[PDB]
């Protein structure tokens, strides 16, 4: 906002709060929230096993 930086090439999420202050280019990657869970391995319960 202070013109101290001519560009801000970085992982900046395009958001409304930021857009009212600065100008963003069109996105080069489109990301979003995702679930990170561990890779399933060999396991099973007692009764549901059979």
């Amino acid at each position: 906002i202070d013109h101290k930086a001519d560009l801000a090439v970085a992982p900046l999420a395009i958001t409304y709060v930021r857009e009212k202050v600065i100008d963003f280019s069109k996105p080069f990657m489109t990301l979003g929230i995702s679930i990170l869970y561990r890779k399933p391995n060999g396991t099973n319960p007692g009764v549901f096993s059979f």
Partner: protein, 51 residues
């Protein structure tokens, strides 16, 4: 995907370089060169599958 947030380069309000940097980004995406650099390091070592 849960949300659809987008990235991008930052420019001050009214800066004339935004309208050209978006053109450059779109050209890079169209030629697929953004996908190559997206696969440049995200596939750091690959998935070891033996089974």
């Amino acid at each position: 995907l849960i949300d659809s947030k987008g990235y991008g380069v930052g420019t001050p309000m009214g800066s004339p370089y935004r309208d050209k940097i978006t053109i450059a980004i779109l050209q890079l995406q169209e030629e697929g060169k953004l996908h190559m650099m997206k696969e440049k390091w995200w596939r750091g070592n690959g998935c070891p599958e033996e089974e």
